[PDB]
Each structure stands twice: as C-alpha cells, then as structure tokens.
Design a binder for this molecule. Structure first.
Ligand SMILES: [Zn+2]
Lengths: 93, 85, 109, 278, 54, 286, 152
C-alpha cells in the first residue's frame, strides 16, 4: 500500500488475512513476537503501526518508486542544497 | 553650474578615509599583540642554575658553588660588578 | 583647474579605497594568526611535567624554582597562570627543556 | 676551491623516514644513511633515505656494513633507480641539537668516501605539525685557515641561516664545521593531499559523517548559565568611581565567541531536518 | 494541594493525577537576575556619560 | 578478521615516490607494491611499505612478477631493523580491478591469511576519502563453481601518530581548525548532499541501466533490500511528516527559544562593552 | 610578496607623495621580505621628495632587529638622500656619521654595515653632481633608472 496511511483500519486485515474482525489482536501481537516488524499497534481502534520490513520488488523492475521518490529526492535535496549555497553564497566570504 | 559643487560632495568619499586610517590603527594594535605572542620563544628556553658565590678573586671573575656540586671559578656577564657581587 | 582637481580627487579617493582593502584583509588574517598563536603556543601542556617547588619571583613572570632533583633554578613563567596560586608556594608543574612553570599540582591536604 | 652557499633540497620521504626512524629510535640514538645525487657544489637534492639496522655498541662508521649496502641497494638496483650514498644521520631524539663526537667519528670517513658528506642532527619533540627541527652541517678543513672565512656569493641565505641566532654548541664548535641551508623543496602534489587528509582525517568527521546536536545544547545551556553568572558578577566591580589609578589585573571577561559559534552550530544543526530532509 | 504541595495539579478526568514540573529552567531566571543589575550598572554609568560631556 | 584499519600517509608518499620512480620512465605506467603492516589489534596498523619491481601484461592478464629476494630478504632486513612491522597486504594503482587481482590474492593469502590489498589513486581530487582496503573470503556463489575468491570490501579509514606532520603542515600554512559555523560544515553539506545524491544518481542511473541492459540486481537482492532501508521514509505526495508536524514544532521550540533568549543575552554582552569601551577611549581627547 | 612591495615605486613614481601613508604598516610586517621591500618601497618611491617623513619612518627601519633589513635600510637612506641635498633634510650628515657609526665600529653587524659605505658612495655620486633620474624634463623615463634599478 502506497504509504502515508500507516495508522489505519482493520477490515482490510480481516479481509486479506482470511481472519475475522475479532482475531486481529492475536494476529498483530504474534506477528510482533515473530520479528519481521516491530511497531507497537494502536490497539484501541485496531490501528496498525509498523516498522522495518522485507521487500518484494516495486514497479516491475522498480521504475516508479525509484524515479518519483529517489530522483525526486535527489533533485529535492540537491537543488535545495544549491539553495543552501544560494543563501550561503558568500557567508564563507 | 553642475561642475562646481560636486567637488564638495567628494568629501562624503573622505569619510571612508577616516575609517581606513582608524582600522589601519586597529591593525597596528594587533601588530604588537602578535609580537608579544612571537616573543614567547624566550619562554621556550632553559633558564639558568643557582650558585653559591663564596668569594670573588682578582682579574674579573668570581667563584660559584652549584647547589649539590663543587665550586667553580666562572666568568661574569657585562651587566654586573664585583663591587656588587 | 576645475577639470584637473576634480579629476585627481577621484583618483586619490579610488587609490585610498583600494588601499583600505589591504588592511581589511590583514585584519581578517591576523585574528586567525593570533588564534594560531594562542593554541599552537598553548600546546606547551603536559609533556610529562615534573614536580618541584617555587621560591622567588624577581618581578612578574620570572621565577626561582626548586625541584625534586633538589637544586634551584632561574626561569620565567608563562602569561597564563594566575598570580594568587603561588602565594607562599605550590606543588608546581615544570617543563623539561624549557623547564618553566606550567601548573599547580593539587596539594596533599 | 671556491665556496658558494650549499643548498639541501630534501625529499619529503626523507623527512618522513627521519621522523619515523628516530621515533622508533626511541632513546638509543640510531644511525642511518643518506643516498642522493651530485648536482653541483651549491645545491643538493636528496631523493632517497632508507633505514639502517640498530647497533647497540656505539654509533659508529664501523657499524656501517658495506655488504649490507651492497645487498640492500642490490635489491634496489632494478627497483626504481639507485644513486650514490651521499651521507648519513644520527639522532638526539629528546633534546634539540648539538655537534656530536659521532660527527668526528664518521664525518672524516664519509668525506674520505663521499664528497658532500652532510652530517644530520634530528629531534622530533619541538612540535608535531609546524617546525623544521632537524639540523645539518659539514666539517671544515684545517687547511683553509690561511683564507679568511668570510666569502659567500649569495648572502641572502646566510642572512637567513645565521639569522636564527645559532643556539649553543654549534657556535661552541664553529671551528671544524660550516653550516648548510635546508629548505623543503616543491612537494605540492603531496602537500595538497596531506592538507586534504589532515582536515579530512586529522580533523574528525569524514564529511558524510557529521551531517552533539542536542545533548551538547543541554550541556551548553549549562555553559550558558554557568559562564553567564560569572560574566555578571565581575563587571559590577568595574571603575564605577572617578579614580585615576592605573594598575589593572587582567582577566578579559567577555565570553562572547563560545556563545556565538556554539549557537551558530546549534541553529544550523537544528536546520538539519529541513536541510537534509527536503 | 492548597496549603502544601507536591505539585499535583487537579487532574480530575485522567486517572493518574500526574505529578510533574521542570524546576531547572533557571538559565532564564539567572539571565533575568543579570539584566536587573546589568542596567543598574549602565544607569550608574549614564551619570558619567551625560555629566562629563555637558 | 579485518574490519577497519589505522593507516598513516607515510605509505602514501611511499606510493608517490615509486610513482616518481616509474612515471618519467613510464613504460608499464603502474605502481604496485607491498603493504607492510604492524598487525596489533583487530584494527590494523601500517607504518611501512615498499613497492616491488613489477609488471602486469594485458594478454591473458595473469603475467606478473615479484622479486623474491626483494620480497624475502628485504623484508628480513626490515624485520631486523623493525620486527614489530611485518607483512599484512599489498597495494596497486589502476583502480579498475582485473583478473590478475585474484592471482596476487592467491599468493597474498599464503603470507597472511586475512590479507588486504590497497587500491590507490595517484591524484585524489576527490570528495574525498583516501585509498581502498579489501577482504578476501570465499562465499563461493549460488553457482556451484570451484572456489570463488571474490574480493569483499573492508571499510577503510585513517588514523594518526605523534610527530609526523612537522614540516609538511608547516609548509602548507593554510591550516584553519576553528572556523566551524561558516565554512567547515557547509563544505560537508555540499559534499554529502550533492555527492551522495549524485552517487545516488549513479544508483538510479546505473540500476535503470541494469533495467535497460545490465545485471538487473537479482541474486544480489540486497540492493533493493537495502533500498528498503532507504525506504524507511516513503514520503507519499504530502511528504508524510504531518505526524512529525508537532514533533518538528517541539524541535523548533527548544532551539528557537534558545536563539531568542541567548542571542538577546549575546546582544547584552556585545553592546554594553562596545558602548562603554568606545565612549571612554573616544572622549579621551588628549 | 617582496616583488609586490618592490613594484610600488616602479608604477607610482609620478606621484611619490602617497607612499608613506600606504607602506606605513607594511614596514611592520612579519618577514624580512615585506619589511625589506617596504624600506625599498619608500626608497625608490620618494626619491626627489623633500619629504623627511620617509626618513622618519626609515629610522625604526634602520634600527630594526633583522640584520639585512638594516643593511637595506641604510641603502634606503641612500635612496631617500639622493635627489636631495644637505639642506633638503637636516639628517644628511647625521646619516653620514651614522653610516660611520655602524661601519667604522666592528661590533655592529657586518652584513648590516656593508650598506653604509656603499650608501655613502651613492650619497657622493660625483660629489652630488650626478644622481638618479626616473623623470626627465621631457617626461620620457630613463631605461637605466627603471631597468637597472629594478635589477639592482
Ligand atoms: Zn645523536
């Protein structure tokens, strides 16, 4: 899922997990005890919270995530580093 | 009558001169601050020994007994008289 | 002479405004030089300093110092040490070649 | 014959081997050799200085094994390019310098063998990055005493070599000696790269790895209270009267630059989120 | 809570009654105590300043 | 085994001087030499090295020549003058690796089991870091070949030693230690930002070149597995630190209140001394 | 740096009346180079001036701690005192007996007293008949008085 939704619902868990609405707490606490993810779940509304995870490749040879995040970030911090230079133009003097 | 009074206006220019002269004085301040710091090689030297002058003798020398050691007839510097030794 | 006086006042002005920049740069330089003076002289630290004794100062910063080699010497002390740490004495820290007063050891108490 | 101011261009490898070989030569005053090129009378560039094995008897020319030289330089024959052994070096690794008796042991030997035969006196103590502590000289004949010993054709470098006001035992032994100039030649390809690898190594942070940001500000607000009240307590007792007394005790209170630079660091390191992030 | 304290503010609807404060903040206090006397010095110097001129 | 080192630039000039040996006479144009190492700790240490007379041909690229008197008994003379220094590895130029590397690896491992070679550069105008360090282990592959001695990399670093810059830093004179606040960190800013995201532009560029025609990093899946370690932050279309909204507010909080309070007190430092000192020394007319 | 403080009178001898105010703290540099070239700068700059400020500033330059800047300051005293007569500045005979002081004693610096009699000869070039001439009546500058002095 294309993040920025990490604290979320439970019906997609009870739908894709082929589990019920009730048995998601066993699910999340046992999955934390396994050791593939380490985020302490917001349990009051069955709201997920996640950490480090193991990947299975992105867009078909990692086109889209790589471009629109990696190179977007490249030109982000690169060009705003040029802006750091632009305001720090002669503070080296 | 433009080309008369611009010359007078060129003393706003001369305000930079006073500031120039005075920061030249400011540099002249640090010049002997740095000379005081350059002086400190004299601190970097072995100073001297103490000595027991028992009694002087003729012909512009004295005797000196060093603190654990024996006596040593030694020579003087240019700044000291045997009348004062 | 209003074509040549007004010519050359500008000239001597631009001269002195160039000549200001030299001393502006030297004032930039010598503060760095004085900092290099500060720290690169104050590396005079504890190269394994010896314990001795302090006896006399003829004036400001020129000592007469006894040692735990027993004898008595005649050196100068730095521009750093406070003059009310040696007030009859101290357990003192001395260099070796320069053999000058560096520091006050903690007394026995 | 005629005399003109001799110049010692040094290889910077020689500087490194002198400091290292005398550093390992811990107090026991090691001996090594100098291996160089005969350009003229008034200059010498040394190109190679290698190591000689430690002898615990007495620092001598008789410890110089010539077949050790033959074998070592034999390995060095096809290795790069060999040259003439043009001198030697001993060590006084704690104190500055003096003109040893080891000089008058081996110097006549190497001025018999070689021609320029430069004595070399060394010390590592006097600094770590900013001095020229090594010292070098050369024995004078007794036969030139009919000549008065004041010709020198380029007296800028004797006006730079006499200029440091020569210290103790050198002019205790002005006789049997005459000095020699030792500059550091053009070594810029190494100079710039050790400048790089000094403010890239010998100052911490390999620049990917600096951008302590906060706990230093906890300790620094401890600083900026504890330093502050002492900056407060003192200038109350400034010359609040009309006295014309002129005798200061000097303590120069001010404490400005700590605040200044530390808080520029704090603000531009609080910038790190908006800087490195987006 | 009234007369004495252990700085327990009335936390009616939480369930802990959280007992909290940060007593070392006194860099700001100390700077205030500085300013109060720093300009006592300055005001004492102003007499010289506006006296020795005219 | 070998993890990080302590290396002093005497080896660096011991590279550059043999570069002066074979540069003007340049026929095989390469400086390949032996790295003596005072192996003290798990951290390595070097204070000596020598360059072997050596060649390396292109055809079949496995013809190469040591000098085993210069390798054995020169090392023995060195062991006599310094037994603390012993062998730890070697070094070469030509940072493009090749096929003879594994052969001199085969011979460097019999002198020292956890050996390490050094890829150098003769002109680093780099970001920069100095010369390289490897580690030779056998992981063979997922392939089933006879033993694959593929060069694994040790993270290289530099140490220090007393009294080894005495004339050199004296000659440069451009030494400026205490100026962090204007320049010494903006250099790092320019450096890690631009030079890390352009190495990352080589990452996207090289790996999209693998997408087009290349390895397409399968079977070393640690590539995108570690781009997931990058992808701790996904930053999806609102850049997603609106949970760090108040956290960044509370971060701006502390330092900007420090800024306001402390710099007002910094004014209270500057102004009073400046005005009093100036008014005194100015109204003293003579 | 020495060449930079040597080029000054070479480019500014049409107006020698600014050199004291601009080489003033240059006479108080760190090295023998800029101090030496500073003495020479006031020397080759203010040749025909009846200035005596250049003289007054060469006074702590001829009493400097560095030896061959005292040499070069005697030579700069020769430079200021030519295109100058006795009554142009009252220290001409003071510098004659001052050269005499420093050279006719032995205990002063040999390298720093070499300049004294050579500077006397500069001062008595033809018995003040002949002197240096950077600036003609025509304004055509003279090639010995530029080229020879820069090599000198
Ligand atoms: Zn020795």
């Amino acid at each position: 899922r294309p993040a920025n939704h990490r604290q979320l619902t439970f019906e997609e868990i009870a739908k894709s997990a082929k589990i019920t609405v009730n048995e998601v707490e066993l699910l999340v606490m046992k999955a934390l005890s396994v050791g593939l993810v380490k985020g302490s779940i917001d349990e009051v509304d069955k709201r997920v919270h996640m950490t480090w995870v193991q990947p299975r490749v992105l867009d078909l040879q990692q086109i889209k995530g790589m471009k629109d995040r990696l190179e977007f970030w490249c030109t982000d911090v690169k060009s705003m580093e040029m802006l750091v230079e632009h305001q720090a133009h002669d503070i080296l003097t | 009558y433009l080309s008369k009074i611009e010359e007078l206006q060129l003393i706003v220019n001369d305000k930079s001169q006073n500031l120039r002269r005075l920061q030249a004085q400011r540099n002249e301040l640090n010049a002997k601050v740095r000379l005081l710091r350059e002086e400190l090689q004299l601190l970097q030297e072995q100073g001297s020994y103490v000595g027991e002058v028992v009694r002087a003798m003729d012909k512009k020398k004295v005797l000196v007994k060093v603190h654990p050691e024996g006596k040593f007839v030694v020579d003087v510097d240019k700044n000291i008289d045997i009348n004062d030794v | 002479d209003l074509y040549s006086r007004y010519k050359k006042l500008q000239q001597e002005l631009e001269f002195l405004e160039v000549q200001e920049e030299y001393i502006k740069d030297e004032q930039k330089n010598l503060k760095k030089e004085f900092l290099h003076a500060q720290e690169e002289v104050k590396r005079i630290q504890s190269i394994p300093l010896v314990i001795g004794q302090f006896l006399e100062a003829v004036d400001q910063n020129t000592a007469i110092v006894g040692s735990t080699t027993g004898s008595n010497y005649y050196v100068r002390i730095l521009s750093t040490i406070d003059r009310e740490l040696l007030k009859p004495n101290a357990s003192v820290a001395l260099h070796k070649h320069s053999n000058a007063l560096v520091d006050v050891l903690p007394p026995e108490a | 014959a005629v005399d003109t101011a001799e110049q010692v261009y040094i290889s910077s490898l020689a500087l490194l081997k002198m400091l290292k070989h005398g550093r390992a030569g811990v107090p026991m005053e090691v001996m090594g050799l100098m291996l160089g090129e005969f350009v003229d009378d008034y200059t010498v560039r040394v190109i190679d200085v290698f190591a000689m094995p430690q002898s615990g008897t007495g620092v001598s020319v008789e410890a110089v094994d010539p077949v050790f030289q033959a074998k070592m330089l034999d390995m060095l024959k096809q290795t790069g390019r060999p040259e003439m052994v043009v001198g030697w070096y001993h060590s006084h690794p704690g104190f500055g310098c003096w003109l040893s008796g080891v000089d008058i042991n081996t110097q006549q030997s190497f001025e018999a063998l070689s021609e320029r035969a430069v004595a070399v006196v060394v010390d590592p103590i006097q600094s770590v990055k900013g001095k020229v502590v090594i010292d070098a000289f050369r024995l004078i004949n007794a036969n030139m005493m009919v000549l008065g010993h004041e010709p020198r054709q380029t007296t800028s470098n004797l006006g730079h070599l006499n200029k440091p006001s020569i210290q103790a035992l050198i002019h205790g032994l002005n006789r049997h000696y005459y000095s020699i100039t030792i500059n550091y030649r053009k070594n810029e390809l190494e100079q710039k790269m050790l400048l790089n690898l000094h403010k890239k190594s010998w100052m911490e942070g390999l620049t990917l790895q600096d951008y302590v940001v906060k706990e230093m500000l906890e300790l620094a607000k401890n600083y900026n209270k504890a330093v502050e009240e002492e900056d407060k307590m003192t200038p109350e007792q400034l010359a609040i009267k009309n006295v014309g007394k002129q005798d200061p005790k000097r303590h120069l209170e001010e404490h400005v630059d700590v605040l200044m630079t530390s808080n520029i660091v704090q603000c531009l390191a609080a910038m790190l989120d908006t800087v490195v992030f987006k | 809570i009234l007369d004495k304290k252990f700085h327990g503010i009335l936390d009616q609807g939480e369930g802990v009654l959280i007992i909290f404060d940060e007593p070392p903040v006194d860099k700001t206090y100390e700077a205030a105590l500085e300013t109060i006397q720093n300009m006592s010095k300055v005001v004492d110097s102003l007499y010289n300043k506006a006296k020795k001129l005219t | 085994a070998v993890q990080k080192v302590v290396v002093h630039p005497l080896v660096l000039l011991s590279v550059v001087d043999h570069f002066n040996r074979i540069g003007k006479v340049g026929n095989q144009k390469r400086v390949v030499g032996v790295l003596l190492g005072s192996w003290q700790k798990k951290v390595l240490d070097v204070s000596n090295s020598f360059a072997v007379p050596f060649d390396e041909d292109d055809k079949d690229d496995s013809v190469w020549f040591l000098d085993h008197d210069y390798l054995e008994n020169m090392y023995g003379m060195f062991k006599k003058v310094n037994a603390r220094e012993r062998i730890v590895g070697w070094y070469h130029t030509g940072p493009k690796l090749h096929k003879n590397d594994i052969a001199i690896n085969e011979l460097m491992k019999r002198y020292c089991p956890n050996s390490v070679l050094v890829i150098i550069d003769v002109k680093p105008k780099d970001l920069g870091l100095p010369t390289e360090a490897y580690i030779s282990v056998e992981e063979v592959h997922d392939d089933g070949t006879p033993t694959s001695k593929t060069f694994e990399h040790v993270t290289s670093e530099i140490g220090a030693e007393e009294a080894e810059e005495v004339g050199v830093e004296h000659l440069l004179r451009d030494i400026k230690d205490t100026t962090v606040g204007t320049l010494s960190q903006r250099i790092t800013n320019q450096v890690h930002g631009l030079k890390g995201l352009n190495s990352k532009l080589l990452d996207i560029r090289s790996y999209l070149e693998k997408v087009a025609t290349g390895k397409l990093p399968i079977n070393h899946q640690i590539i995108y597995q570690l781009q997931d370690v990058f992808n701790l932050l996904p930053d999806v279309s609102l850049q997603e630190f609106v949970k760090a909204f108040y956290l960044k507010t509370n971060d701006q909080m502390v330092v900007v209140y420090l800024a306001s309070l402390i710099r007002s007190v910094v004014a209270l430092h500057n102004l009073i001394n400046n005005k009093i000192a100036n008014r005194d020394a100015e109204k003293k007319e003579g | 740096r020495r060449a930079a403080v040597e080029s000054l009178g070479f480019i500014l001898f049409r107006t020698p009346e600014q050199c004291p105010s601009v080489v003033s703290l240059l006479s108080e540099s760190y090295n023998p180079h800029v101090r030496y070239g500073a003495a020479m700068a006031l020397g080759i700059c203010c040749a025909g001036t009846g200035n005596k400020e250049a003289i007054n500033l060469l006074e702590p330059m001829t009493n400097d701690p560095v030896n061959y800047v005292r040499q070069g300051a005697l030579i700069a005293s020769a430079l200021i005192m030519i295109q100058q007569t006795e009554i142009t500045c009252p220290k001409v005979n003071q510098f004659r007996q001052l050269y005499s002081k420093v050279i006719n004693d032995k205990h002063d610096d040999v390298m720093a007293k070499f300049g004294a009699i050579l500077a006397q000869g500069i001062l008595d070039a033809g018995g003040h008949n002949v002197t240096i001439s950077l600036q003609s009546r025509t304004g055509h500058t003279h090639m010995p008085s530029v080229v020879g002095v820069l090599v000198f």
